[PDB]
Amino acid sequence: SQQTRVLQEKLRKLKEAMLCMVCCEEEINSTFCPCGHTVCCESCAAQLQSCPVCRSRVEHVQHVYLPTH
Amino acid sequence: SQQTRVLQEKLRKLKEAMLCMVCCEEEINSTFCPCGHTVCCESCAAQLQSCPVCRSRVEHVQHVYLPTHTSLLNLTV
Numbered sequence: 194s195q196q197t198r199v200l201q202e203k204l205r206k207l208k209e210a211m212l213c214m215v216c217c218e219e220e221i222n223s224t225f226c227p228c229g230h231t232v233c234c235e236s237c238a239a240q241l242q243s244c245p246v247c248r249s250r251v252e253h254v255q256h257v258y259l260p261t262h
Numbered sequence: 263s264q265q266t267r268v269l270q271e272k273l274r275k276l277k278e279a280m281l282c283m284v285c286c287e288e289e290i291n292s293t294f295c296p297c298g299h300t301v302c303c304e305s306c307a308a309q310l311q312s313c314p315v316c317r318s319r320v321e322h323v324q325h326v327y328l329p330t331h332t333s334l335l336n337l338t339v
């Protein structure tokens with residue numbers, strides 16, 4: 194039904210939001226510290242000196258284990 | 263259809279996985295450090311001395327800004 198389509202859309206948007214903002218191919222699993230933006234996969238996060246969202250200096254990258262992984 | 267119910271179930275399980283494992287009422291937004299388990303809201307994470315998943319001691323809690331977060335602001339109309 195049209196309801197099935199609406200639910201398909203919500204699921205797709207949630208899935209897209211889980212992907213890395215830099216490569217768009219891998220699941221997010223890293224956090225920039227101390228700002229806390231959690232927007233990249235480990236490979237893309239490892240290469241950044243500053244946060245791609247807020248420009249704060251990245252002191253370190255913390256790997257995150259999320260229940261949605 | 264039955265597929266509408268299946269999709270409703272998948273969406274419900276994904277939404278439940280985004281809620282705090284301790285209170286079940288607020289979105290996850292905190293990481294236990296150093297273990298890295300990101301399973302609580304800020305209120306439950308502040309009260310735990312050890313991680314509820316792996317029992318590693320919590321040295322500090324890091325707030326996380328996730329692209330999936332929602333608030334009362336996201337309400338339609």
Ligand SMILES: Cc1csc(NC[C@@H]2CCCO2)n1
Pocket residue numbers: 210211212220221222231259260261279280281289290328329330331
């Ligand atoms: C709000 C929340 C709790 S767990 C989760 N998973 C979706 C994430 C966003 C970053 C990678 O997937 N979101």
Ligand SMILES: [Zn+2]
Pocket residue numbers: 213214215216217218219233234235236237238
């Ligand atoms: Zn990436």
Ligand SMILES: [Zn+2]
Pocket residue numbers: 225228229230244245246247248249
């Ligand atoms: Zn940032």
Ligand SMILES: [Zn+2]
Pocket residue numbers: 282283284285286287288302303304305306307
């Ligand atoms: Zn909680």
Ligand SMILES: [Zn+2]
Pocket residue numbers: 294297298299313314315316317318
């Ligand atoms: Zn842990």
